[PDB]
mmCIF file of C-alpha atoms and ligand atoms in Angstrom:
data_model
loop_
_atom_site.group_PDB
_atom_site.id
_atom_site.type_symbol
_atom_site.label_atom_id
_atom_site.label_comp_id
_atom_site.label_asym_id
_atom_site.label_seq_id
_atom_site.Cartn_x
_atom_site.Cartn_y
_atom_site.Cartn_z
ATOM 1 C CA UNK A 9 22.206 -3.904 -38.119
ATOM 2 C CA UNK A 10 25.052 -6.149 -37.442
ATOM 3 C CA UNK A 11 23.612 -9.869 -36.856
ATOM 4 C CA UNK A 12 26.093 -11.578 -33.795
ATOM 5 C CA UNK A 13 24.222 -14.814 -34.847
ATOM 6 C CA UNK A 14 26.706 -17.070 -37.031
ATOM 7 C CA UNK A 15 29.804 -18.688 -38.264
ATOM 8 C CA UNK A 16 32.822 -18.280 -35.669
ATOM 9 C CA UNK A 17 36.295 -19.194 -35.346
ATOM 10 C CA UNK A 18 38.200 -18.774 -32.006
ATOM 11 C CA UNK A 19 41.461 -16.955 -32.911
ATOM 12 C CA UNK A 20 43.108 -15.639 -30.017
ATOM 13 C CA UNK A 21 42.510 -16.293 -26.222
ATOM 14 C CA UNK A 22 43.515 -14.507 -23.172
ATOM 15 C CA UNK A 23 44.245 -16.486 -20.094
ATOM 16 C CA UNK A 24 44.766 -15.727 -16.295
ATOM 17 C CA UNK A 25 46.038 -19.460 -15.871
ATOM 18 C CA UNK A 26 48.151 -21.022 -19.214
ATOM 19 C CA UNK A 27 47.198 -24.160 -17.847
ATOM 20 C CA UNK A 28 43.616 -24.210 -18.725
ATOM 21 C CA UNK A 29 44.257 -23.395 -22.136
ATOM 22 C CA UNK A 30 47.067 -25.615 -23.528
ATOM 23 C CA UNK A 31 46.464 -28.880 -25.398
ATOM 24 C CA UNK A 32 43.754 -31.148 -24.631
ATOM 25 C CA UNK A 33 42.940 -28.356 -21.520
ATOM 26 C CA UNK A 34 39.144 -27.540 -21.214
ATOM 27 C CA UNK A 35 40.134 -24.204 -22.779
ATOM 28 C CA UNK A 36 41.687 -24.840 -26.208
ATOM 29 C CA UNK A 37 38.300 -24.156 -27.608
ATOM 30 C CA UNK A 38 37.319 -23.802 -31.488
ATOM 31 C CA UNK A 39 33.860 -22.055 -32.177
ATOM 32 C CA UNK A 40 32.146 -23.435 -34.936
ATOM 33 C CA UNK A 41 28.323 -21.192 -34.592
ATOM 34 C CA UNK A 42 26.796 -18.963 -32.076
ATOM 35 C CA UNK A 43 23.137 -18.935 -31.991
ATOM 36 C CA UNK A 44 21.934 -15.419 -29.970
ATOM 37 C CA UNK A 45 17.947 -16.002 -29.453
ATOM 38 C CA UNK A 46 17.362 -12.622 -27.659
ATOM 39 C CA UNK A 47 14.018 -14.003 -27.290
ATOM 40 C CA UNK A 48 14.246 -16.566 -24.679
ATOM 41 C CA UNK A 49 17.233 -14.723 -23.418
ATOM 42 C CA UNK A 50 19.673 -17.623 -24.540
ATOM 43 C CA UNK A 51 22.868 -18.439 -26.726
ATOM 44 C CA UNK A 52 23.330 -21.990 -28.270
ATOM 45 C CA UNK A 53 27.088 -22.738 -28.841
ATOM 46 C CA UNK A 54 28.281 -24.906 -31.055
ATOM 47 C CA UNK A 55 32.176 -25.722 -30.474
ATOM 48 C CA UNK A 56 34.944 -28.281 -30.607
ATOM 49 C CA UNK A 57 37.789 -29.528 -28.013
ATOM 50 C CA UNK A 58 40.480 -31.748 -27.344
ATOM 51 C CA UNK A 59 41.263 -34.614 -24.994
ATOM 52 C CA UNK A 60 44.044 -37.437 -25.529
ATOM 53 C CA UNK A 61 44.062 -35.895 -29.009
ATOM 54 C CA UNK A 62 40.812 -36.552 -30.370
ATOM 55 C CA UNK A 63 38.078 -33.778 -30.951
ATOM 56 C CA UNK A 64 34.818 -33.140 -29.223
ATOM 57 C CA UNK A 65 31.779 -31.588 -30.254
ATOM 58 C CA UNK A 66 29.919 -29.589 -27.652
ATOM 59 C CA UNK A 67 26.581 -27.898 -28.433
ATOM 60 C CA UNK A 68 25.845 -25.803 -24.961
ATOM 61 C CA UNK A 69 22.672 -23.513 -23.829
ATOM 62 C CA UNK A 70 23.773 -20.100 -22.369
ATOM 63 C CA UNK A 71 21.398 -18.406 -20.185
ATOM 64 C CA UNK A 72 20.960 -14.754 -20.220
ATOM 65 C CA UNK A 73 20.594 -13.605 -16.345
ATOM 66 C CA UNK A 74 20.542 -9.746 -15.551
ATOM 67 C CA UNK A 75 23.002 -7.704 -17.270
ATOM 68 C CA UNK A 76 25.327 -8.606 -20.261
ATOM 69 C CA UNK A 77 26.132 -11.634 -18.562
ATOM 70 C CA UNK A 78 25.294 -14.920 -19.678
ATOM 71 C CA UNK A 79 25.585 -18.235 -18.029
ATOM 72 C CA UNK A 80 26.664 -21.940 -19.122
ATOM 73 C CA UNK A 81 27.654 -25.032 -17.302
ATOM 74 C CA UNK A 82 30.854 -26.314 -18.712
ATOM 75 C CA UNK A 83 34.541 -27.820 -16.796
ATOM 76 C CA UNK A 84 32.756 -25.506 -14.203
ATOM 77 C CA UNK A 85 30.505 -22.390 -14.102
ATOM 78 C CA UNK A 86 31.030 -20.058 -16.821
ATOM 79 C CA UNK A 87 30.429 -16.153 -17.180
ATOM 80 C CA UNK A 88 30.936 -14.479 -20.378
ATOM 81 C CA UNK A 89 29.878 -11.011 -21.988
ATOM 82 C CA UNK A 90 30.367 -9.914 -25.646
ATOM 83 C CA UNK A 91 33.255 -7.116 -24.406
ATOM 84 C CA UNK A 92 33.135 -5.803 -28.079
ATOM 85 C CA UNK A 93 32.183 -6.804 -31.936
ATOM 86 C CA UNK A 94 31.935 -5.356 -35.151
ATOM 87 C CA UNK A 95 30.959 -6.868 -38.204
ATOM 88 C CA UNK A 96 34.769 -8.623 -38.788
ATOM 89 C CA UNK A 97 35.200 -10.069 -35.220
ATOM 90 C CA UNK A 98 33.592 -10.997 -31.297
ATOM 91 C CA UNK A 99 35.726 -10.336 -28.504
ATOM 92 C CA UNK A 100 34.392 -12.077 -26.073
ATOM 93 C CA UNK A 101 35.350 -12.733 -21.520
ATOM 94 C CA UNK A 102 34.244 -15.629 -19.487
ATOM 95 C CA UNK A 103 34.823 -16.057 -15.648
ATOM 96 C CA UNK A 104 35.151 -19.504 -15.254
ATOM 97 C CA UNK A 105 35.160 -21.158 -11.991
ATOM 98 C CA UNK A 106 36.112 -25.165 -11.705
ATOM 99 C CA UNK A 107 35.293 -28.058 -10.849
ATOM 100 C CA UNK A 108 37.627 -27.232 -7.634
ATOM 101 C CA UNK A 109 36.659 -23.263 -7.169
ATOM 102 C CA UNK A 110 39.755 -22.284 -8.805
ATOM 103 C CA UNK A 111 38.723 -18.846 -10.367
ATOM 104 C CA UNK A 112 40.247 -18.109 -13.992
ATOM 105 C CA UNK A 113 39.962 -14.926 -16.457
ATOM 106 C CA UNK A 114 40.019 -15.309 -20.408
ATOM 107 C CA UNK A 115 39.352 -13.275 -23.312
ATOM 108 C CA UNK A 116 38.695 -14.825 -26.593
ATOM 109 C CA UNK A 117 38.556 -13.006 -29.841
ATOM 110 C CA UNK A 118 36.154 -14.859 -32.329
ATOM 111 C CA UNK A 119 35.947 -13.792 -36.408
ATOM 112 C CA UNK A 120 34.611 -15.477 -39.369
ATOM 113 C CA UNK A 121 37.825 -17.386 -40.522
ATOM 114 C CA UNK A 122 41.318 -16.461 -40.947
ATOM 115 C CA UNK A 123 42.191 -13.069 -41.641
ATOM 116 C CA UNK A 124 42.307 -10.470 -38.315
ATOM 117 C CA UNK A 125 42.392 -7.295 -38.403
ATOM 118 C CA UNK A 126 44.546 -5.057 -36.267
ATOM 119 C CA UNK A 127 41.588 -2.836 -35.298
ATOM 120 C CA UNK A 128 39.978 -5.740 -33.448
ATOM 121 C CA UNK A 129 43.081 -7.166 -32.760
ATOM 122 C CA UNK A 130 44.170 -4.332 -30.765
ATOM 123 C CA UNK A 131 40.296 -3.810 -29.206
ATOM 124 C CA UNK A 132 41.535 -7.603 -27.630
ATOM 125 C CA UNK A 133 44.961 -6.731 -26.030
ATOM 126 C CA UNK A 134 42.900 -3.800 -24.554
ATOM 127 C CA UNK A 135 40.663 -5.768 -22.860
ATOM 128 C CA UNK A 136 42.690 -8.761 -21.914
ATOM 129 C CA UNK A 137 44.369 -5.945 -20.153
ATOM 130 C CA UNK A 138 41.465 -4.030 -18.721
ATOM 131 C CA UNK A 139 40.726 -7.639 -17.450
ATOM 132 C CA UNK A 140 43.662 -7.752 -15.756
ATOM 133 C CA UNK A 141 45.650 -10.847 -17.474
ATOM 134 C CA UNK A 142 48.875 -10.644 -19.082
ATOM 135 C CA UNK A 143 48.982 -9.475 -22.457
ATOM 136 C CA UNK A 144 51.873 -12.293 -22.941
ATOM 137 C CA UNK A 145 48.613 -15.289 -22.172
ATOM 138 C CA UNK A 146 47.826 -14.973 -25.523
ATOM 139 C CA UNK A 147 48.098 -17.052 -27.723
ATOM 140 C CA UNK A 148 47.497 -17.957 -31.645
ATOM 141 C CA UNK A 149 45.125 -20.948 -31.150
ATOM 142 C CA UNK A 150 43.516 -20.963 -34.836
ATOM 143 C CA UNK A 151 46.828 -22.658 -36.434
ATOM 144 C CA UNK A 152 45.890 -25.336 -33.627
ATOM 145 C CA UNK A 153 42.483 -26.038 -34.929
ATOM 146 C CA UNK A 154 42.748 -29.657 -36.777
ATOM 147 C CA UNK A 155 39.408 -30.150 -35.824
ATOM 148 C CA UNK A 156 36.335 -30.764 -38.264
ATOM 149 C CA UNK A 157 34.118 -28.335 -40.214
HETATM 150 C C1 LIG B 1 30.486 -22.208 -25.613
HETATM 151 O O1 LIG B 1 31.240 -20.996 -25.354
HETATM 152 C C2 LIG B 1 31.617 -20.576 -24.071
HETATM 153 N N1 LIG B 1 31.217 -21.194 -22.958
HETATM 154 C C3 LIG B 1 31.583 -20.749 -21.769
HETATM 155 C C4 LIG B 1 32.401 -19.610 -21.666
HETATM 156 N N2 LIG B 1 32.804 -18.984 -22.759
HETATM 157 C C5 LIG B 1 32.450 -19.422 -23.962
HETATM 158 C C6 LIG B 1 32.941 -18.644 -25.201
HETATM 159 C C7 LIG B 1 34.104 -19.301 -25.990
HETATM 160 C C8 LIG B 1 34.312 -18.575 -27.329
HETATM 161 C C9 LIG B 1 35.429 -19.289 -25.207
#
């Protein structure tokens, strides 16, 4: 009824560590698409980054293993769940572990462009919380995004 499969723009991310997120980190990421394929239990991601300054296109596989969770290989192992959607936005969670075993918690709310609604907005501060990070880790990251269409 409400296809996840699209367009998506990261506007907001929750972070247990502001470190991983700030400029040129591995976690000042832009969606650009989201492919769901429910059939092979998968999730192709389509998003940009940083590093020195210049943008990055990433195109990853996400592997559905039992439960919500998914997985993906990426600046370390990656865990993430769709926490929430509607048909405006995608609040999504991702354990990450690094490179070094440093464990890290983030939220990210994901829409189709610009304009946020408080309903979802709120939904995300709820569940940043629930996740147990700050509410003051996030962070507008959308007036960042200089990268390409
Ligand atoms: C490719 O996307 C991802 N890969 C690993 C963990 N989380 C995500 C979701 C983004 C929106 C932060």
């Amino acid at each position: 009824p409400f296809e996840l499969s699209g367009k998506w723009i990261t506007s907001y991310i929750g972070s247990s560590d502001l470190e991983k997120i700030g400029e040129n980190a591995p976690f000042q990421v832009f969606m650009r698409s989201i492919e769901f394929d429910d059939k092979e239990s998968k999730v192709y991601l389509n998003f940009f980054s940083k590093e020195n300054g210049i943008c990055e296109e990433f195109s990853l596989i996400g592997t559905k293993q039992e439960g919500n969770t998914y997985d993906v290989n990426y600046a370390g192992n990656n865990k993430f769940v769709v926490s929430y959607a509607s048909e405006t936005a995608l609040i999504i969670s991702n354990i990450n572990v690094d490179e070094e075993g440093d464990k890290t918690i983030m939220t990210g709310l994901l829409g189709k462009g610009t304009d946020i609604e408080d309903q979802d907005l709120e939904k995300f501060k709820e569940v940043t919380r629930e996740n147990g990070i700050p509410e003051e880790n996030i962070v507008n990251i959308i007036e960042r995004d200089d990268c390409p269409a």
